[PDB]
């Protein structure tokens with residue numbers, strides 16, 4: 001298939017492009033590079049084993065989007081592109097709604113113009129809001145996301161849903177991600193955050209290669225076994241695989257297909273830290289800081305639907321997630337080159 | 339004040355401009371004329387006693403919005419522009435989200451660029467979703483709107499809300515409308531829907547003016563006192579007034595100011611029918627029809643907040659609404675001229 005991967009030079013996108021290419025698909029990457037670097041391109045190619053076309057551009061450029069869809073004869077669209085920092089979303093809501101809400105709106109509008117009707121969306125567990133029932137099941141009604149980030153994702157879901165009603169020929173996948181972590185086993189591709197890493201894994205990794213003093217653990221008095229936050233961490237390679245499968249399996253299958261993509265188990269921040277210390281042969285530095293605004297105590301995925309339906313499930317352990325992260329971080333302390 | 343009134347040539351906005359001009363404000367109307375006619379302009383100026391500045395254009399055009407706010411030195415915006423046909427919204431969700439959600443996004447983004455910080459949004463009682471508690475109070479949690487129309491409204495509410503949090507110097511009024519009806523007492527201004535009218539009042543008036551054979555009342559079964567749908571009807575003139583007060587009072591007062599604008603009392607379809615017949619002098623031809631999809635059985639506003647805080651309440655009566663509508667319909671049976 002002729003797939004257009006927006007946000008393809010980004011963390012999840014690049015890994016996904018690798019698996020796609022490995023599967024023989026024709027990959028066209030569309031990325032504005034606001035959170036990624038061109039230098040990942042040759043890596044995706046080398047590892048993908050096949051050349052993916054690259055187009056520097058914005059999902060908000062409807063005309064450009066239409067042009068690509070047509071010119072490249074696209075069959076399906078995997079939409080990873082967007083803004084994804086929770087904290088920042090609070091500080092700059094408009095940028096979030098623009099990129100996320102309007103950015104997706106523009107792309108699908110272009111898809112309509114180009115007559116493309118297969119779509120895969122980068123969703124999120126935030127859509128569930130403050131859900132007391134855990135783990136999260138796709139059948140649960142969506143809650144109220146706390147941040148603009150979270151809201152923007154739910155908003156997009158709703159829109160895609162309405163669109164699919166109005167255009168019943170469309171196959172739309174709403175893929176709800178949990179906590180993607182880890183890196184290509186090659187140690188040559190991985191997450192490459194700019195500035196102070198917001199996320200857990202990346203934060204630890206920089207601590208360990210010495211980019212940071214100490215891991216600040218947000219809150220220690222949660223209603224959890226160790227008091228720290230609990231999450232469903234998933235290896236980015238597993239996530240990547242789930243996309244190829246979803247794309248291959250759902251194309252041309254009308255409907256809104258919702259799936260939690262997670263391991264279906266919780267791990268605390270400390271367990272994460274222990275794994276890391278274990279992967280890197282030296283204890284990681286952390287101190288306890290206050291709870292982070294909007295952090296939930298604990299949740300994880302019920303991913304049985306995908307298993308049943310896509311025959312997909314995770315295969316990498318937390319350990320590999322950590323080993324693999326350390327491998328990338330150590331080979332490339334400052335990430336990708338300019 | 340120097341006021342940008344988007345959708346200013348439309349029904350509500352037109353009436354609002356007249357009132358604003360009557361208070362001596364400087365008004366700039368921005369309207370893409372997708373549901374209005376230029377011919378309304380001169381009436382506005384005539385009835386308002388002052389010339390309004392008009393600009394033909396689209397709220398989605400951010401550069402234009404910016405240029406307008408800037409060159410015009412606008413200090414407050416009243417945002418009526420958008421699409422509002424419920425049924426069509428279901429068939430054409432994207433256009434809805436684009437004009438309403440993105441249209442508003444573009445508009446506020448322009449405001450930030452031009453440093454304008456006063457806004458009034460035309461909200462709707464639809465945000466309440468399916469609320470069994472009647473009448474509706476501003477403190478009630480929002481619900482799940484059933485159409486792309488209602489959803490877009492709610493989405494705009496939350497976006498504006500997040501924006502205010504991030505830019506706490508903004509004064510944002512979310513004015514929730516119920517069922518606007520009536521017309522300028524001059525009978526020279528009033529609603530002028532194109533094609534087959536979606537709303538009750540225009541239909542009745544068209545029946546009454548011989549433009550339609552018989553009014554269909556949707557559902558006789560309703561758990562109401564007459565089995566017909568119950569609603570909060572508000573005279574457009576009271577509504578315009580409410581906008582003027584809100585604009586005047588909320589200017590430069592930081593916060594998200596949410597208010598139901600309504601009469602605070604319910605009236606059935608048949609109630610309204612009877613009001614018109616007595617207004618028009620002939621019994622209004624009608625019949626029963628099955629329920630219209632999405633219709634709620636009965637709802638009305640709790641408007642005490644606005645009475646309390648803004649010292650505003652409705653002064654016009656139901657008969658006045660019908661009488662005035664009739665007077666405009668009778669005077670301008672074909673609406674505004676081409």
Ligand SMILES: NC(=O)c1ccc[n+]([C@@H]2O[C@H](COP(=O)([O-])OP(=O)(O)OC[C@H]3O[C@@H](n4cnc5c(N)ncnc54)[C@H](O)[C@@H]3O)[C@@H](O)[C@H]2O)c1
Nearest residue numbers: 007010011012032033034035036058059081082084122124
């Ligand atoms: N639990 C969650 O909420 C969950 C968790 C992690 C990631 N995700 C989502 O997965 C997707 C990809 O995540 P990631 O970790 O790879 O992030 P990332 O930042 O590494 O990937 C996003 C890519 O999108 C690009 N981009 C952003 N705005 C764009 C625009 N307007 N036009 C073009 N390209 C643009 C960035 O340059 C980057 O290369 C995002 O939608 C993110 O929200 C969801």
Ligand SMILES: NC(=O)c1ccc[n+]([C@@H]2O[C@H](COP(=O)([O-])OP(=O)(O)OC[C@H]3O[C@@H](n4cnc5c(N)ncnc54)[C@H](O)[C@@H]3O)[C@@H](O)[C@H]2O)c1
Nearest residue numbers: 345348349350370372373374396397418419420422460462
């Ligand atoms: N119960 C409800 O939810 C409720 C009820 C009535 C009105 N309202 C809202 O009040 C507002 C005014 O309603 P109205 O009855 O006067 O409708 P209207 O159609 O008469 O006015 C809207 C005006 O905006 C203009 N317009 C629409 N899209 C535009 C765009 N993208 N750019 C520029 N101009 C554009 C149209 O030409 C029209 O003149 C709307 O936002 C409507 O949704 C809400």
Ligand SMILES: O=c1ccn([C@@H]2O[C@H](COP(=O)(O)OP(=O)(O)Oc3ccccc3)[C@@H](O)[C@H]2O)c(=O)[nH]1
Nearest residue numbers: 084198199200203216217218229230231269292295
């Ligand atoms: O420096 C950090 C960052 C995170 N955490 C904790 O680790 C867990 C995971 O947090 P996260 O920020 O890495 O991810 P998330 O759980 O908020 O989920 C995401 C992931 C990507 C985008 C949006 C939400 C949480 O309990 C968090 O409080 C820390 O203790 N220290």
Ligand SMILES: O=c1ccn([C@@H]2O[C@H](COP(=O)(O)OP(=O)(O)Oc3ccccc3)[C@@H](O)[C@H]2O)c(=O)[nH]1
Nearest residue numbers: 422536537538541554555556567568569607630633
């Ligand atoms: O030809 C008509 C029009 C409406 N109705 C009924 O009249 C009432 C009012 O309906 P409406 O369409 O005039 O307004 P609404 O109550 O749905 O509210 C609106 C108004 C504008 C935007 C969105 C919702 C309802 O009980 C509706 O079923 C009829 O019986 N016949």
Ligand code: NA
Nearest residue numbers: 090091503504
């Ligand atoms: Na802030």
